[PDB]
Amino acid sequence: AYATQGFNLDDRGRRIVVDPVTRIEGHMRCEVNVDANNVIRNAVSTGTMWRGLEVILKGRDPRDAWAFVERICGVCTGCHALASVRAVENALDIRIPKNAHLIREIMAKTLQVHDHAVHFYHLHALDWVDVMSALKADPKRTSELQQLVSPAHPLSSAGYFRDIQNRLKRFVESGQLGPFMNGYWGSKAYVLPPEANLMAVTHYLEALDLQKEWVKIHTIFGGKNPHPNYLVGGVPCAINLDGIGAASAPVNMERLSFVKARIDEIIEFNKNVYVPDVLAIGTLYKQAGWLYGGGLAATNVLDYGEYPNVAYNKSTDQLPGGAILNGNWDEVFPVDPRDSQQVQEFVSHSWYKYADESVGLHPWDGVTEPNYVLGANTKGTRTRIEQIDESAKYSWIKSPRWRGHAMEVGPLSRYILAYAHARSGNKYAERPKEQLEYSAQMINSAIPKALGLPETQYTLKQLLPSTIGRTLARALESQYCGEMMHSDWHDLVANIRAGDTATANVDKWDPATWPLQAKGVGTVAAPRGALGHWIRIKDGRIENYQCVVPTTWNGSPRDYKGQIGAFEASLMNTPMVNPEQPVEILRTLHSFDPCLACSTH
Amino acid sequence: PRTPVLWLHGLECTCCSESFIRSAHPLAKDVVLSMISLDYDDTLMAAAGHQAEAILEEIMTKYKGNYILAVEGNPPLNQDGMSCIIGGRPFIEQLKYVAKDAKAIISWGSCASWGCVQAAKPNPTQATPVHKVITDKPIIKVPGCPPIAEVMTGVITYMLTFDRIPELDRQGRPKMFYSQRIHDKCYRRPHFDAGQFVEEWDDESARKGFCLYKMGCKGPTTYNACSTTRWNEGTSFPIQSGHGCIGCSEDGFWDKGSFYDRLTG
Numbered sequence: 089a090y091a092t093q094g095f096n097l098d099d100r101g102r103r104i105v106v107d108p109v110t111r112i113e114g115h116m117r118c119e120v121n122v123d124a125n126n127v128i129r130n131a132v133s134t135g136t137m138w139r140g141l142e143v144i145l146k147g148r149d150p151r152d153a154w155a156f157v158e159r160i161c162g163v164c165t166g167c168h169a170l171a172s173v174r175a176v177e178n179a180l181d182i183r184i185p186k187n188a189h190l191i192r193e194i195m196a197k198t199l200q201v202h203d204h205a206v207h208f209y210h211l212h213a214l215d216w217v218d219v220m221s222a223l224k225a226d227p228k229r230t231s232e233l234q235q236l237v238s239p240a241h242p243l244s245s246a247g248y249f250r251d252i253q254n255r256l257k258r259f260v261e262s263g264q265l266g267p268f269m270n271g272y273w274g275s276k277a278y279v280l281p282p283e284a285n286l287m288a289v290t291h292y293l294e295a296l297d298l299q300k301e302w303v304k305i306h307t308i309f310g311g312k313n314p315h316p317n318y319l320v321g322g323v324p325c326a327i328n329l330d331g332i333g334a335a336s337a338p339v340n341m342e343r344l345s346f347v348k349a350r351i352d353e354i355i356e357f358n359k360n361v362y363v364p365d366v367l368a369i370g371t372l373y374k375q376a377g378w379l380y381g382g383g384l385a386a387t388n389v390l391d392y393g394e395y396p397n398v399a400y401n402k403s404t405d406q407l408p409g410g411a412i413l414n415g416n417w418d419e420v421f422p423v424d425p426r427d428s429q430q431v432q433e434f435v436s437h438s439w440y441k442y443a444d445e446s447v448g449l450h451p452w453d454g455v456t457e458p459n460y461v462l463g464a465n466t467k468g469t470r471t472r473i474e475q476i477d478e479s480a481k482y483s484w485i486k487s488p489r490w491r492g493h494a495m496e497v498g499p500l501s502r503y504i505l506a507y508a509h510a511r512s513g514n515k516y517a518e519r520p521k522e523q524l525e526y527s528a529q530m531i532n533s534a535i536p537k538a539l540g541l542p543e544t545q546y547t548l549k550q551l552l553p554s555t556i557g558r559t560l561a562r563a564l565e566s567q568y569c570g571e572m573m574h575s576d577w578h579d580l581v582a583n584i585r586a587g588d589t590a591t592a593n594v595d596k597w598d599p600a601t602w603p604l605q606a607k608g609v610g611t612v613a614a615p616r617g618a619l620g621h622w623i624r625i626k627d628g629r630i631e632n633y634q635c636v637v638p639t640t641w642n643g644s645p646r647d648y649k650g651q652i653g654a655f656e657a658s659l660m661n662t663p664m665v666n667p668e669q670p671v672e673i674l675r676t677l678h679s680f681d682p683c684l685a686c687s688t689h
Numbered sequence: 690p691r692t693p694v695l696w697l698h699g700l701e702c703t704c705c706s707e708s709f710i711r712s713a714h715p716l717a718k719d720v721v722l723s724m725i726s727l728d729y730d731d732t733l734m735a736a737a738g739h740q741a742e743a744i745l746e747e748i749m750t751k752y753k754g755n756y757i758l759a760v761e762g763n764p765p766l767n768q769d770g771m772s773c774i775i776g777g778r779p780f781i782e783q784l785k786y787v788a789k790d791a792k793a794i795i796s797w798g799s800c801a802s803w804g805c806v807q808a809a810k811p812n813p814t815q816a817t818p819v820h821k822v823i824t825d826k827p828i829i830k831v832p833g834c835p836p837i838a839e840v841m842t843g844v845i846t847y848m849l850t851f852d853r854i855p856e857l858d859r860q861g862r863p864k865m866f867y868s869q870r871i872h873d874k875c876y877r878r879p880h881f882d883a884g885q886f887v888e889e890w891d892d893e894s895a896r897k898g899f900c901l902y903k904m905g906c907k908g909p910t911t912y913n914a915c916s917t918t919r920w921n922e923g924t925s926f927p928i929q930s931g932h933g934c935i936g937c938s939e940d941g942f943w944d945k946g947s948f949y950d951r952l953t954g
């Protein structure tokens with residue numbers, strides 16, 4: 089047992105293993121210890137995959153890198169490509185034209201919405217929603233709930249909900265439960281009434297059909313989704329308004345109109361389906377007293393800051409970043425990805441090796457040499473682990489820290505940062521502040537009043553650092569991203585109509601024009617938090633390429649000082665209804681939206 | 690009853706799973722609810738840990754020789770296989786276990802088919818395609834990074850309707866989707882035929898949709914349905930949106946030189 093970061097870790101209780109952790113991207117193992125009353129008193133995050141992209145990149149052409157690193161992940165598809173082209177452009181002093189900037193922003197915000205909404209419905213919802221309970225719902229009362237939760241959503245009739253319920257009934261009655269097989273249905277950890285479950289399952293199905301439409305924005309600008317194409321110096325999707333037949337361009341007015349139609353659909357979905365569902369589900373779990381899962385969000389949060397309303401002008405970031413420590417929201421520290429003393433990665437408890445593992449390496453000096461070795465207290469063998477030994481090396485995820493501090497990253501971090509910035513007088517963060525205040529009022533008062541529940545008085549400081557808050561911030565971010573790209577579209581079309589059709593700067597395309605050595609960094613507010621790629625170029629080739637990815641931060645194992653990362657902190661001090669059913673573990677881990685391929689790359 | 694599908698994930702990026710759910714015809718919703726029984730899939734399944742693993746034995750026993758194994762990603766042979774761990778054990782052990790009683794095996798995507806990005810030089814994990822590990826079972830390769838959504842659901846639809854693997858080429862790819870090179874029906878082909886090429890990004894030629902051969906397009910050597918079926922319900926494909934094909938459905942495409950270096954000859 090030891091104390092760290094205000095957490096009292098204790099591994100003397102009953103050990104529980106969850107492997108595989110499902111409804112995430114990629115491969116994770118989680119172990120906990122629970123006390124005499126089933127409360128988690130120790131948590132262990134193990135990334136169970138590695139591919140070695142950083143090693144693979146060595147010696148290759150910086151212009152090709154984006155395509156390699158894009159394949160770090162097909163869920164957060166394109167965010168690595170964006171980080172890569174930004175890193176190369178930074179190294180080579182390339183400035184992209186305005187249309188390329190706007191198209192990249194639109195693609196980024198499309199990813200945010202798609203990734204967030206699919207995460208919530210298809211990966212997260214089953215931690216809050218009992219599908220079997222949905223079978224018991226009254227269709228008319230479900231219709232009535234839908235009208236209260238979201239008056240503007242037109243899919244609300246009792247007949248509609250009855251038809252969806254009937255299809256679910258027949259599916260279950262077949263005896264082939266598919267994705268619902270061996271689920272935790274009926275657990276006392278589930279608190280929703282049947283009608284809320286049926287509404288949510290209905291939206292799960294609605295979202296599954298709709299998500300394929302949103303990504304057509306990627307398809308127009310980047311050729312395909314998953315894995316749209318990017319370009320060092322701009323975008324490949326050249327613009328020509330008059331061009332028809334043999335002279336047809338990738339982007340004309342009809343293509344832009346198509347994009348706008350998709351953006352308008354996104355805005356409807358976020359406002360009418362996604363945000364109201366999370367507000368309602370959040371309210372009901374709040375009423376049940378389920379405010380667990382805050383972890384590091386209560387103290388230390390970080391993001392690089394993103395979405396400048398003026399390109400290359402960081403003061404205009406619409407999700408302004410930095411770092412908060414010790415839960416002091418009155419002080420945002422600036423974060424500099426170039427500073428060797430700020431972002432560093434340890435491998436003390438990871439399956440890698442450094443010359444000296446008492447130090448953390450800034451990614452320009454990063455090293456990725458695998459070292460799969462298990463500690464003396466392991467139960468099992470090298471190829472058959474029964475209980476992992478967290479006192480030694482226990483993960484394929486490195487341990488990123490900021491000035492030595494363990495930080496949480498992600499939409500929640502960005503929303504806490506936005507709130508802090510707005511309170512200091514930052515006008516660019518007005519919208520997220522407005523969303524947060526609106527959400528707190530809905531959760532505390534409006535939804536309770538509508539549902540005949542007691543009104544509560546939680547502050548944002550109390551509500552946000554929780555698994556509910558983390559889930560809320562993601563939904564709000566989706567909505568904000570849809571709104572922003574609606575504006576970006578207008579700016580893009582206006583710029584083109586004013587006569588600027590440029591999409592690529594090719595002045596430094598040819599490596600004969602490059603400095604003989606250079607270093608660069610590209611950062612992105614990726615769906616799961618703070619993403620950075622750090623590159624060193626020598627004689628036209630990649631000398632070093634290091635990625636520090638959002639789930640690397642959140643899912644990280646302990647560092648040299650034994651400080652825990654966001655996943656482990658979040659599980660601490662949570663009661664489990666049944667230690668053998670990982671309902672609460674999944675609910676909280678899933679609230680970070682773990683991407684394990686991203687975390688390990 | 691609906692044919693059980695056990696969908697395993699090795700080393701991967703999950704692009705094939707994402708592509709699958711983009712399918713418009715048929716909808717992935719209809720595939721899952723009405724066509725297959727998707728009994729194991731890390732991405733979507735309710736059960737975790739012990740409850741998830743217990744599904745595999747149950748389905749393999751009840752549907753012995755009558756379930757489909759779908760594999761996304763691939764097994765690593767280095768690090769004693771523990772660069773991909775499932776249930777405390779190497780992925781390769783799960784793969785071999787589930788494969789033994791499958792009636793057919795689908796290798797989804799370039800990862801499972803050939804190795805894809807993790808197998809690019811110097812392949813630190815010795816990531817190895819499924820057909821090099823499973824050598825005694827019928828395997829259909831559906832390559833591409835990822836494959837087109839309707840190609841994936843088209844393969845499933847054929848297999849379920851006919852209880853057969855469709856006709857394959859010598860590389861194990863379904864002829865119904867991989868018989869054409871991109872360059873055969875690429876809409877920029879008339880420009881190629883006239884020697885009309887983009888030479889620099891966003892040049893006048895690029896704005897007129899000239900051929901991308903000199904910008905490195907690997908369409909002439911790449912077999913896929915991208916030029917005709919296209920992507921995301923026929924919305925575009927890489928070339929239509931202005932970037933050359935990078936050869937993503939072909940074996941070892943990461944190690945055939947820069948994406949921007951033109952083909953020779």
Ligand code: SF4
Pocket residue numbers: 871872873875876877878879881899900901902906907908909928933934
């Ligand atoms: S763009 Fe590529 S596939 Fe199309 S005609 Fe030119 S070389 Fe062939």
Ligand code: F3S
Pocket residue numbers: 312833834871911912913915926927928933934935936937938
């Ligand atoms: S890069 Fe891949 S998606 Fe099609 S156009 Fe080329 S085979």
Ligand SMILES: [Cl-]
Pocket residue numbers: 460461462463470
């Ligand atoms: Cl060992």
Ligand SMILES: [Cl-]
Pocket residue numbers: 799803804805806808939940941942943
């Ligand atoms: Cl390959």
Ligand SMILES: [Mg+2]
Pocket residue numbers: 142486634635636637689
């Ligand atoms: Mg890294």
